[PDB]
Amino acid sequence: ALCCLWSDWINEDHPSSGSDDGDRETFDGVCGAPEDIECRSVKDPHLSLEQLGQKVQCDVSVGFICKNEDQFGNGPFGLCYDYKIRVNCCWPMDKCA
Ligand SMILES: [Ca+2]
Ligand SMILES: [Ca+2]
């Protein structure tokens, strides 16, 4: 009885853009509190996080966080993929019919 829908992709940050040395995606201004979140690599969007092999955080409280230094590599090499997220948002059933 809760009408749920997945948002469009959000991709506002990039691993070599901004000042965070990583990729963070938020659902602020899209959903108040998402029921679920889907985090995918831009270049390989069919691969779930379980198939992707990076060290990231993806959850319904903080959204998506990847820190470049957490990724495989040595010296200056190795960083986050660029990620995008959808959020699953739910509303009363009377908003679906
Ligand atoms: Ca960045
Ligand atoms: Ca991104």
TrEMBL record:
It comes from the Eukaryota. Coiled coil: none annotated. It is found in: Secreted. This is Mucin 2, oligomeric mucus/gel-forming. The lineage of its organism: Eukaryota, Metazoa, Chordata, Craniata, Vertebrata. The chain holds residues 1301 to 1395 of 2817 of the full protein.
